């Protein structure tokens, strides 16, 4: 019984995902987030383990839901006449990385190192669970401000991870690789690495490097803010024009700029607690 179990709260957002409301699970007064997805608007569908058909978004969330805190977790879900409703964790207090970056501008490297590190573990998690996010960016990342933990959200453009070429893509253009732009083809891992690179530039310069199609393909990176040489290196590396030339996840995490990561809590005390 959907509307017995939860107590609708304020619309928290509307965008390329749909309509998200704050909610309380009356059953234990747990802070949750209720999201509505219209059937008419879902272009990608998938089969539950049971195999019955849901929106891919749900398939992907089930697959990563256990047991990490790196990724937002799907509690439950329901079907309606024209919509599916998803019940997902709600951290509080929370802010998303974009809003965070807009308020506080470009970030200290020690902080960007922490976040960026945590994003890496959350993308590894998804890859490990057989899931490709396809829309990694500041908007799709929440900062739990007390714990200093980051959570990856919004699997609405995602896909089951595979080793072959993808030829569809409905994520955020500006974070998409040159080879998508030029050839409508890409591979999951390599494209994720690219997006991970735009994100890093974003963290450390307070804004994305490439705005237009031509600059993405040109692939040449200008820094508008004092950035460490080691960090500029990992960035230019992540954004190698040729996919095979890009760093794997291991290599990013074994990079000299990635060393000495703060722990999440530590990061909150040092940077998030005012």
Numbering used by the authors: 33 to 306
The authors write:
We determined two crystal structures in this study: those of inhibitor-free Pim1 and inhibitor (SKI-O-068)-bound Pim1. The inhibitor-free Pim1 structure was refined using 2.4 Å data to Rwork and Rfree values of 0.221 and 0.249, respectively. It included 274 amino acid residues in one monomer and 68 water molecules in the asymmetric unit. Eleven residues (Lys29–Glu32 and Leu307–Lys313) and twelve residues from the C-terminal fusion tag are disordered in both structures. The inhibitor-free Pim1 structure is highly similar to the inhibitor-bound Pim1 structure with a 0.263 Å root mean square (r.m.s.) deviation for 223 Cα atom pairs. The A-loop comprises the conserved DFG motif, and the A-loops for the SKI-O-068-bound and inhibitor-free Pim1 structure show an active “DFG-in” conformation, which is similar to other Pim1 structures. The structural conformation and hydrogen bond networks among Lys67, Glu89, and Asp186 are well conserved in our inhibitor-bound and inhibitor-free structures.
